Amino acid sequence: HHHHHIQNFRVYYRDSRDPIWKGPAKLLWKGEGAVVIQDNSDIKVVPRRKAKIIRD
Amino acid sequence: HHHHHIQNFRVYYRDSRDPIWKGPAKLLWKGEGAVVIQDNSDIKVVPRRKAKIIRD
Amino acid sequence: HHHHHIQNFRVYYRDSRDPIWKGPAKLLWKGEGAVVIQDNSDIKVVPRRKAKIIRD
Ligand code: NI
């Protein structure tokens, strides 16, 4: 069981109540108001406002 | 590998063809017509009509 | 931890840059422009244009 990340996509994300950006994370899904990322072994939901998707 | 749940959100869900509600479950994703929940070690997709999302 | 597939749904999917169809895969989620499938132990995101969802 493994969640293959969207190729050529890295995300920097801001956890609630912390201005420091974390990453780079892998993008697993992109919704209307949030995105799913995998930071190493942690998969989290991040509102788009707290995400910086970066193409490659 | 772990799916971190949406904080301050618990869901009660109705499996197809069973009126009894199950839960409380953790909310992992919220779409237009369905929601993703994690009931212990089981992650399932539940139509919004069969879900009771409860904020905290 | 397990991702229960949408019942009565099998998907055939085309990986980017390969015309050969793979499957059958299990449907885990259905979005606006893409779908989430599980091909054995691999969970991938597939644009709807590269997916053949088949009801049962
Ligand atoms: Ni998983």
SS3 C48: helix
Cα A17 to Cα A44: distance, rounded to the nearest angstrom: 15
CA-nearest of C45, C36, B8, B4 to A44 is B4
Write down the residue that tokens 């050529």 correspond to: A8
Using a CB–CB cutoff of 8 Å, tell me whether A7 touches chain C. yes
- What are the percentages of helix, strand and coil residues in chain A, rounded to 5? 5, 60, 35
Q: Which helix (H) or strand (E) element contains residue A38?
A: strand A34-39
CA-nearest of C38, C5, A43, C44 to B1 is A43
Complete DSSP assignment for A14-28? --TT--S-EEEEEEE
Residue A36: closest C-alpha in chain C: C45
Cross-chain residue pair C2–B41, CB shorter than 8 Å: yes
Cα C11 to Cα C48: distance, rounded to the nearest angstrom: 10
Cα C25 to Cα C54: distance, rounded to the nearest angstrom: 10
Q: Are B5 and B40 in contact (CB under 8 A)?
A: no
**How far away, in angstroms, is A2 Cα from ligand 1 center?**
7
Look up residue C27 and give its amino acid. L
Spell out which residues of chain A touch residue C1, defining contact as CB-CB under 8 Å: 1
CATH 1.10.1520.10 fits A9-55, yes or no: no
Residue B11 has which token pair? 């869901």
Write down the residue that tokens 């994300």 correspond to: A13
Query: How big is the CA angle at C54 (ends B53 and C37), to the nearest 5 degrees?
Result: 55
Q: Classify strands C2-3 and B42-47 as parallel, antiparallel or unpaired.
A: parallel
Q: Are B23 and B14 in contact (CB under 8 A)?
A: no
